[PDB]
Design a protein around this ligand. Structure first.
Ligand code: FZR
Length: 265
């Protein structure tokens, strides 16, 4: 019977979906038994640097949603010095958890999920965000669509051990300290997700030891395996996305003109 009020509406807590730093996300119902997700952030312990991360998420979320419905909706929010409440579109489940239920992936549904991810990542790029750490967890399934929930700025949360299987080569090499943030590095992480959606595993998921995994990502003569597949366009998408040179990696605008997106067979 736990409750939350936001602006002038009361919401009943069905369950806590997840949590992270000082944040928690709940599945809730409004006055009329309509379902929502509410993110709660406890701002009491919060340095002025995290405070600004949460403020930035809210502004972009509020701006970015006029421009695409593949971004999760933020309906209303309340922020004070002590807390934040965000009332949002509630997803059936995140893509990481839905992929780990290692079930069949329909080819047409994988194609349409890919379109969804490209559109969402495209619109954040048009407003100057590079997410930089995309993962399946960042996408939610809602009415047969994928919708992005993070812009990669605020504290990332876990359902109620991070991952590295999606990290792009530029991120590793650009640790040895003009360390630019290229839109190309989101293509790599999208490429890894589609790979996982194609072949049931991350490119370098086999390398269970993690220092050696980091080297494979950055080593040119470590070949990624692209087993031949009936969808020849899909195999090609995965090849152009997982090129180690970001300059030669395919771009999002190119990916939207690619036969895999554009020819419906
Ligand atoms: C597993 N699962 C997820 C849902 N639905 C859902 N999860 C959300 N966050 C989850 C928090 C843990 C990590 C994965 C996302 C949000 C959300 C934010 N932030 C805004 N709407 C949401 N809907 C149902 N089951």
């Amino acid at each position: 019977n736990e409750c939350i009020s936001v602006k002038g509406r009361i919401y009943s807590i069905l369950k806590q979906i997840g949590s992270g730093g000082s944040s928690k996300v709940f599945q809730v119902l409004n006055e009329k038994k309509q379902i929502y997700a509410i993110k709660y952030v406890n701002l009491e312990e919060a340095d002025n640097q995290t405070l600004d991360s949460y403020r930035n998420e809210i502004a972009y979320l509020n701006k970015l949603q006029q421009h695409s419905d593949k971004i999760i909706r933020l309906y209303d929010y309340e922020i004070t010095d002590q807390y934040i409440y965000m009332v949002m579109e509630c997803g059936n489940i995140d893509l990481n958890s839905w992929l780990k239920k290692k079930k069949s992936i329909d080819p047409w549904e994988r194609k349409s999920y890919w379109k969804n991810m490209l559109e969402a990542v495209h619109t954040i790029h048009q407003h100057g965000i590079v997410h930089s750490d995309l993962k399946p967890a960042n996408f939610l399934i809602v009415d047969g669509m994928l919708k992005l929930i993070d812009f990669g700025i605020a504290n990332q949360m876990q359902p109620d051990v991070g991952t590295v299987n999606y990290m792009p080569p530029e991120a590793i090499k650009d640790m040895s300290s003009k360390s630019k943030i290229s839109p190309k590095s989101d293509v790599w992480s999208l490429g890894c997700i589609l790979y996982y959606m194609t072949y049931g595993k991350t490119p370098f998921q086999q390398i269970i030891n993690q220092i050696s995994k980091l080297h494979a990502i950055i080593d040119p003569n470590h070949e990624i395996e692209f087993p031949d597949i009936p969808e020849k366009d899909l195999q090609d998408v995965l090849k152009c996305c997982l090129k180690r040179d970001p300059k030669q990696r395919i771009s999002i605008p190119e990916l939207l003109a690619h036969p895999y997106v554009q020819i419906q067979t």
